[PDB]
């Protein structure tokens, strides 16, 4: 889940 | 009577966390799909929008100790208070004069009218102008708009935290800067932080408003698909 949110949250 | 070393440092890093985040030049506008003037408006604030999410959580990486909450509380704090941050953002290209967002050239000038072929109706558009109007005649030192924005992100009554008392924490620090800085700082300030109070307060009630009109986009797939990958993960209601 919140794929692109953990991501951009490093 | 005089902000200690600790408040100042917070101000400089939440300036600097703005400056890094906000471009006044709006030169990356022009990679968004165009605008269009049914909702021919949707692609390019989608994308706007989406653009601006990225800054925000760009910005929340960088407010002293929201790093080191849990991921966790990190986007439950993203996915409630983007939109109000957004709002609050967008007050630097909103203009009294024009009633509306001008971010470079006329083709990104957004009108109300340009917000309501994204679908907005006016009862979301009226309070989100009538508050960019309000926000806009507090003239806020830069300082005060980092700070109000850092303060939205850092609310610990949103759905979703975990750990409640540390973003209280966090937000109280904040909380006790600005009141400091305007005191110190801002020539007759005396009314201003009750004022800056209330605009969270009426972020809320738009965000609500919004939040019911996303889901009735979000609910039509012939929409929805128009809409940006982070979009749909911030503002759906994945847990
Ligand atoms: C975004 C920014 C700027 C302007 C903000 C604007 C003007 C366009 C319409 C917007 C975006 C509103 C609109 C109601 C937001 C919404 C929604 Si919605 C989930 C139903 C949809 C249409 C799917 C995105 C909220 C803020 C409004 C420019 C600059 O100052 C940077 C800043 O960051």
Redesign the interface.
């Known amino acids: 889940?919140?794929?692109?949110?953990?991501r951009?949250?490093? | 009577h005089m902000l200690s070393d600790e408040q100042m440092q917070i101000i400089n890093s939440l300036v600097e966390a703005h400056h890094k985040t906000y471009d006044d030049s709006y030169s990356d506008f022009v990679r968004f799909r165009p605008p269009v003037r049914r909702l021919s408006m949707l692609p390019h604030l989608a994308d706007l929008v989406s653009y601006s999410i990225?800054k925000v959580?760009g910005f929340a990486?960088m407010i002293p100790g929201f790093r080191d909450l849990t991921?966790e509380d990190?986007?439950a704090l993203?996915?409630s208070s983007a939109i109000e941050i957004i709002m609050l953002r967008s007050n630097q290209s909103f203009s009294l004069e024009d009633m509306s967002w001008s971010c470079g050239g006329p083709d990104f000038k957004y009108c109300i009218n340009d917000v309501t072929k994204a679908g907005h109706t006016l009862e979301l558009l009226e309070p989100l102008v009538k508050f960019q109007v309000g926000l806009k005649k507090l003239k806020l030192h830069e300082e005060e708009h980092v700070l109000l924005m850092a303060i939205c992100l850092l609310s610990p009554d949103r759905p979703g935290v975990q750990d409640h008392v540390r973003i209280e924490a966090l937000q109280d620090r904040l909380c006790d800067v600005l009141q400091a800085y305007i005191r110190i700082q801002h020539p007759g300030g005396r009314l201003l932080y009750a004022k800056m109070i209330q605009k969270l307060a009426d972020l809320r009630s738009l965000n609500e408003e919004h939040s019911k009109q996303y889901r009735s986009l979000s609910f039509q797939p012939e929409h929805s698909m128009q809409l940006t990958?982070?979009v749909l993960?911030?503002f759906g209601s994945?847990?």
């Not at chain 1, 889940?1 to 953990?6: D, F, M, N, P, S």
């Open positions: 889940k919140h794929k692109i949110l953990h951009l949250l490093q | 990225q959580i990486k991921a990190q986007i993203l996915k990958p982070l993960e911030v994945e847990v």
